[PDB]
Amino acid sequence: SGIVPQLQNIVSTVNLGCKLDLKTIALRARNAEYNPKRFAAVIMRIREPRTTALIFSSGKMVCTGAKSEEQSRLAARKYARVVQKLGFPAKFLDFKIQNMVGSCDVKFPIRLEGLVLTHQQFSSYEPELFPGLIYRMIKPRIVLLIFVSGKVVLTGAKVRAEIYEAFENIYPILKGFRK
DNA sequence: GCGATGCGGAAGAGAGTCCCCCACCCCCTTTTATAGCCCCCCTTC
């Protein structure tokens, strides 16, 4: 195909293995914001990795915004150290990547009306609700947002192989509905 | 003094022609790409 999707966002969850005091973290953490009325977690941001992480009292933390697997793990470790630097016994346990978001362009307009007809079992095109066709691939459990402009967004992948594999499967299908 | 009762008359049926408590699930939130749609404020004259 000659086109490789580029990851736009990765969601990874890591357990620190120790209960944390959310109020204490907000007071001392540099960028943390805690609003129990709004959300029950502590939202923190670190610019150099350019990622955002949510910290819960149970010790589990979710890291989002990383553009690569290495960045997500590095960003998650940095957040854990910040909590550890606050006097808590934070660790890096069962780090896992929960979601990978990738985007790409096929460089040609797509006839979404034709695509849904031939793939009604997997496609879902509702212009009233969303201007982009939602494709649910089965062999890889990846949900693809195909747009008339040609932009394709892949999400729900656990590994980078699924993102590339999913695009390889849909690209020939899109080529058959080129506008 | 101290009770006790049958019959006529009236009545009446009966037939014919809401508020609370206890699971279970969804959304609150964050990140990102995509794009049409639409609110809101601004600006124009």
Q: Indicate the residue among A41, A68, A97 that finishes a domain.
A: A97
C-alpha to C-alpha distance for A49 and A60, rounded to whole angstroms: 20
Distance A166 CA to B8 C1' (A): 107
> Which experiment gave this structure?
cryo-EM
Same domain, A151 and A91: no
Please report where in the chains the tokens 């960003």 appear, as a residue: A75
Same domain, A34 and A72: yes
Using C1' positions and the CA of A104, the closest nucleotide is B33
Same domain, A4 and A41: no
The two counts, helices (H) then strands (E), for chain A are 4, 10
Q: Indicate the residue among A76, A97, A118 that finishes a domain.
A: A97
Same domain, A44 and A112: no
Enter the tokens of residue A136: 């649910």
Residues with CB under 7 A from strand B: A 8-9, 11, 38-41, 43, 45, 50, 52, 54, 62, 64-65, 99, 101, 103, 127, 130-132, 145, 147-149, 151, 153, 155
Same domain, A176 and A111: yes
Enter the tokens of residue A109: 């307009």
Q: Which among A147, A155, A8 is positioned nearest to A68, based on CA atoms?
A: A8
Please report where in the chains the tokens 């357990």 appear, as a residue: A15
**Residue A54 burial (C-beta neighbours within 10 Å; 0-12, 13-18, 19+):** middle
Q: Report which DSSP code applies to A59.
A: S
C-alpha to C-alpha distance for A146 and A125, rounded to whole angstroms: 9
Same domain, A79 and A155: no
Q: Which among A64, A37, A38, A32 is positioned nearest to A51, based on CA atoms?
A: A64
Same domain, A91 and A113: no
Same domain, A87 and A25: yes
Please state the domain count of chain A: 2
Same domain, A126 and A179: yes
Same domain, A131 and A148: yes
Same domain, A16 and A84: yes
Q: Indicate the residue among A78, A97, A116 that finishes a domain.
A: A97
Same domain, A141 and A114: yes
Residue A128 domain boundaries: 1-11+98-179
Question: How many angstroms from the chain centroid is the CA of residue A30?
Answer: 25
